[PDB]
Design a protein around this ligand. Structure first.
Ligand code: CLF
Ligand SMILES: [Mg+2]
Ligand SMILES: [Mg+2]
Lengths: 112, 464, 473
């Protein structure tokens, strides 16, 4: 539901930092990488823990997945497809507010 | 047997004794009522100095920046001055005085401060017809002199500005007094001396209220008390008493050249003889007698010092650093109480003036021990001499030398500016008779605590 | 909405720098301008770019000469002002160096004066073989090439290593520019110019922590317990040479993303080292950070043993303070990051409501973070000035302000207590114990008999002098 998505979005906004990295490309990478691991963890799938980057997306995702299960009873009731659908909507919303409509003027500077 | 002046032998500085000229100009300005200095340069030149004053006084003082940025470094910064003046005037309706203090940046790029002042005077007269704001140009490049010289330059420029505007009027009957760079406690002592001697005097600047109360009504009273009117009246004085050759005497001379107010420069009143001679000069110029109350305060000071001098002070070796008027005055005080000031450090490039200071000769004719006076000194000079074997019983100086004393295990009395690492020292006089007494007792109490911590005859502190 | 304060009616551009968060707003439409030019004459809190390089970052190192190429004021002004201890006797705080630039050097150049100062500094302290040279306003303006001087000194003296930073105070708008110039030069020139022994399967750098009152040394007790080697701390209790080894780490843990994100981003780009942002202030935040580090390394059980012990030791005290601090109103007027590291952590762990925040030099990034974490009805101020601080106090009536000492001494006159939000009162303030230390200082600041005494006017025959009952955790 929209309520479930609003719960996930309000959690990420007030808690997480990975969506607020210094450049557009890093925000995009983190939103995709963290939330794909969240989906895995919330649906009992084997997390990816191969490369250093993968391992770090897992670490960020584990905090969010554990917090979402603790905070939101619905997250233990909805099915795999419903979790995936919500996380796809959450990616879209996080890209919209942290990239597309952010007026942060540094986000596209080519150099760090 | 020999008093020798020598310069620092290194080109670089380690552990500077003083700040730069603009810091001293800021200090001069914050003693004026309804004054906010405007420091034309980068932001650090303002904010670090506001912090330094908070360290010494444990108070806020208002100083503004022109916020020089990259565009002004290429095209010039006059528009930053002009904006800064108007933004001050518009947001502080009671503001009356703005010393416009230059920095290394704005001296290097050659901004025309007097031209900006003409623009701002026109703008302010049009926008605020019933207001007068006095804009004083203060040229303080940091690559010469020090905060000592910058203090003196700002005082002089503010006085020139304000007296230029008001000129000579009716005789006031008052003295002008330039005590130099002293603490609120020193100002409180001088006010008492003049009151007891029935001498009307303006003390420039009057910083007593820098030690401001925390009041039931939440009022902020942390201000300079010297007004435009008080500075303007300097033209009308009977005489000027200048206590500090390097900290305001040049304003006394300016008022003598411009307005025929006779200037009397005296030794800075550290210790008994210098206080005595100050009071004799006041008596000479005013025709007023020295009161019995000052004979008594003097006698109480001598009584206290006599409990200390031959027992605890005699033959003890002292190093002193700080402003030149303070260093030279404290060296004379030390000898009155049998201390031996063997190392005097003065921290800036004004050696050609120090070589002519009459107090050097007063030391050369008095001392029975060699004295080294290192000018253009840093505090590494002190540390390096201790590491090479100089044996000291006492250091007198400001708190930025603290680690030298701590590590060498030498007792240290905090004097001069800034004294941030002890509480309340800004309220304790150092000049005058009471000041001599308070200094001597700090020295003894620092030695006493040292004797206890080091177990050095600590049993002796019973029947002295 | 954006706020035009009464004190800014004649500088109305300030409205786009002040956000009052209101219900239902899309915060993307209300992001303060940040990291723009300062308005002259405002009594902005900002410092200079040189400060951001030497005072904040480089000067933290325990074994490095800090050679400030300029007149002596810049050096005097950055000495006796920081609280970053070391484990070698606080060399960093005891000394400052200047080239003592004179008029003749403005006329003829200062490169030989720098060179001479550099050799004197190495001669005076023969045990010290590392140096950072900084430009200042006038040495930038006259074009002295301090990188070329450093090159000559290292040729002439092969046992020293020298790094240089161009950061005159007029560069950028604030301290922020100094951070950037230092970070990028260091990764370009000095990273991967030596290596150290690796003594653990788990290695990290800790990036953006400056050891304020021992913060870094406190956090190090965690890494030692967990068996993680820290290749380098950037720069708390650090060494020059440890920083040359940063490329060796498996993970970069970032706390100060503002000052030090630059080098974490370049380490990821150039060496593939992942960047993990944490909050190393805040009790429950510290637990999250430890759990992420341990999940990355696969040492989760070791993390849970450490967390359990730390909660057993410290949580009862934390909760004692929460009971007494719940509902108190706080302002944070600091550089920027502590706004977003503290607003929600004091709310979660102490029940404290942050009602106003001001950032000297934060970027739009920092405002995204703080507005995301912060409350409705709170003021969010970019580049605040002193008259604005008074107007904000009248609007929100804080019980405590976390700010620097000078502002703390100003607001004391209004009977508002302060905690030093920069250098701390009784720190450290990071980690589990640190948040208890922060809570203790906040508690002792607000519930202070002097505040009550100051409000009594003894002349009022209707007033008595009260006694207050305090407590201790
Ligand atoms: S904004 Fe920053 S602190 Fe200012 S000068 Fe510039 S680098 Fe330095 Fe230096 S010597 Fe004094 S304090 Fe200035 S006037 Fe020059
Ligand atoms: Mg929210
Ligand atoms: Mg007696």
């Amino acid at each position: 539901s929209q309520s479930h998505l609003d719960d996930l979005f309000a959690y990420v906004e007030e808690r997480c930092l990975w969506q607020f990295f210094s450049r557009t490309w890093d925000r995009e990478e983190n939103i995709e990488g963290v939330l794909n691991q969240v989906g895995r963890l919330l649906t009992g799938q084997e997390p990816l823990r191969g490369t250093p980057q993968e391992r770090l997306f897992y670490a960020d995702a584990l905090a969010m997945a554990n917090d979402v299960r603790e905070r939101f009873p619905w997250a233990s009731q909805v099915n795999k497809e419903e979790i995936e659908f919500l996380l796809d909507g959450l990616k879209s919303r996080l890209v919209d507010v942290t990239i597309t409509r952010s007026t942060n003027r540094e986000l596209n500077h080519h150099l760090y | 047997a020999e008093v020798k002046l020598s310069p620092r032998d290194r080109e670089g500085i380690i552990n500077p004794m003083y700040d730069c000229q603009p810091a001293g100009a800021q200090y001069a300005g914050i003693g004026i009522k309804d004054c906010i200095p405007l420091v034309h340069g980068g932001q650090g030149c303002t904010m670090f100095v506001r912090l330094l004053f908070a360290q010494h006084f444990k108070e806020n003082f208002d100083v503004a920046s022109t916020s020089l940025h990259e565009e002004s470094a290429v095209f010039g910064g006059a528009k930053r001055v002009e904006e800064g003046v108007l933004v001050l005037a518009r947001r502080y309706p009671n503001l009356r005085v703005i010393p416009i203090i230059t920095t290394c940046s704005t001296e290097v790029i050659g901004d025309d401060i007097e031209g900006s002042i003409r623009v701002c005077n026109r703008a302010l007269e049009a926008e605020f017809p019933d207001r007068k704001i006095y804009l004083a140009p203060v040229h303080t490049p940091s690559f010469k002199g020090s905060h000592v010289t910058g203090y003196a330059e700002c005082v002089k420029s503010v006085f020139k500005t304000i007296t230029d505007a008001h000129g000579k009027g009716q005789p006031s009957g008052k003295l002008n007094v330039f005590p130099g760079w002293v603490n609120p406690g020193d100002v409180v002592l001088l006010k008492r001396y003049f009151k007891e001697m029935d001498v009307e005097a303006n003390i420039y600047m009057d910083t007593e209220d820098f030690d401001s109360p925390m009041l039931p009504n939440k009022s902020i009273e942390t201000h300079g008390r010297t007004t435009v009117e008080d500075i303007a009246d300097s033209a009308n004085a009977l005489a000027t008493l200048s206590l500090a050759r390097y900290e305001g005497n040049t304003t006394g001379e300016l008022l003598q050249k411009t307005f025929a107010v006779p200037n009397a420069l005296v030794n800075t009143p550290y210790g008994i003889k210098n206080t005595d001679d100050m009071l004799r000069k006041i008596a000479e110029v005013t025709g007023k007698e020295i009161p019995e109350s000052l004979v008594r305060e003097r006698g109480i000071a001598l009584d206290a010092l006599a409990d200390l001098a031959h027992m605890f002070f005699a033959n003890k070796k002292v190093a002193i650093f700080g402003h030149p008027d303070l260093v030279l005055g404290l060296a004379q005080f030390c000898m009155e109480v049998e201390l031996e000031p063997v190392l005097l450090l003065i921290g800036d490039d004004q050696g050609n003036k120090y070589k002519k200071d009459p107090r050097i000769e007063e030391l050369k004719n008095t001392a029975h021990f060699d004295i080294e006076i290192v000018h253009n000194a840093d505090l590494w000079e002190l540390e390096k001499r201790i590491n090479a074997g100089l044996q000291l019983d006492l250091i007198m100086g400001h708190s930025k030398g603290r680690y030298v004393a701590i590590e060498a295990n030498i007792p240290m009395v905090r004097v001069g500016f800034p004294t941030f690492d002890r509480a309340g020292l800004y309220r304790k006089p150092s000049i005058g008779y009471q000041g001599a007494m308070e200094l001597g007792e700090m020295i003894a109490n620092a030695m006493f605590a040292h004797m206890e911590y080091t177990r050095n005859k600590e049993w002796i502190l019973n029947t002295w | 909405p954006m706020v035009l304060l009464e004190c800014d009616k004649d500088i109305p551009e300030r409205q786009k720098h002040i956000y009052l968060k209101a219900p239902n707003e899309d915060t993307r439409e209300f992001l303060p301008i940040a990291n723009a030019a300062t308005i002259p004459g405002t009594l902005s809190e900002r410092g200079c770019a040189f400060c951001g390089a030497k005072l904040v970052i480089g000067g933290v190192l325990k074994d490095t000469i800090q050679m400030i190429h300029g007149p002596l004021g810049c050096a005097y002004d950055t000495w006796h002002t920081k609280r970053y201890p070391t484990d070698n006797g606080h060399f960093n705080m005891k000394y400052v160096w200047s080239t003592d630039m004179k008029e003749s050097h403005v006329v003829f150049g200062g490169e030989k004066r720098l060179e001479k100062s550099m050799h004197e500094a190495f001669d005076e302290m023969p045990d010290i073989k590392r140096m950072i040279v900084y430009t200042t306003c006038p040495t930038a303006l006259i074009g002295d090439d301090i990188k070329a001087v450093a090159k000559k000194v290292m040729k002439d003296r092969p046992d020293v290593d020298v790094f240089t930073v161009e950061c005159p105070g007029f560069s950028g708008v604030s301290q922020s520019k100094g951070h950037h110039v230092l970070n990028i030069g260091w990764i370009n020139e000095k990273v991967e110019t030596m290596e150290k022994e690796i003594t653990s399967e788990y290695t990290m750098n800790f990036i953006g922590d400056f050891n304020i009152q021992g913060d870094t040394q406190l956090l190090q007790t965690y890494w030692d317990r967990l068996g993680i080697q820290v290749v380098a701390h950037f720069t708390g209790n650090g060494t020059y040479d440890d920083l040359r080894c940063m490329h060796q780490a498996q993970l970069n843990v970032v706390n100060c993303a503002r000052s030090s994100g630059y080098i974490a981003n370049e380490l990821k780009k150039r060496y593939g080292i992942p960047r993990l942002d944490i909050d190393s202030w805040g009790f429950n935040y510290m637990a999250e950070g430890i759990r992420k580090i341990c999940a990355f390394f696969g040492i989760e059980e070791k993390g849970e043993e450490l967390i359990a012990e730390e909660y057993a030791k410290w949580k009862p005290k934390l909760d004692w303070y929460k009971e007494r601090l719940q509902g108190k109103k706080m302002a944070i007027w600091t550089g920027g990051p502590r706004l977003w590291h503290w607003t929600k952590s004091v709310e979660d762990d102490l029940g404290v409501q942050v009602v106003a925040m001001s950032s000297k030099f934060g970027h739009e990034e920092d405002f995204e973070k703080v507005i995301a974490r912060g409350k409705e009805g709170t003021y969010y101020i970019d580049d605040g000035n002193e008259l604005e601080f008074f107007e904000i106090i009248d609007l929100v009536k804080p019980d405590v302000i976390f700010t620097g000492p000078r502002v703390g001494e100003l607001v004391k006159k209004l009977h508002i207590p302060y905690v030093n939000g920069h250098g701390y009162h009784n720190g450290p303030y990071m980690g589990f114990e640190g948040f208890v230390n922060l809570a203790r200082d906040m508690y002792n600041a607000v519930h202070n008999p002097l505040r009550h005494l100051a409000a009594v006017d003894i002349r009022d025959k209707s007033q008595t002098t009260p006694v207050i009952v305090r407590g201790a955790a």
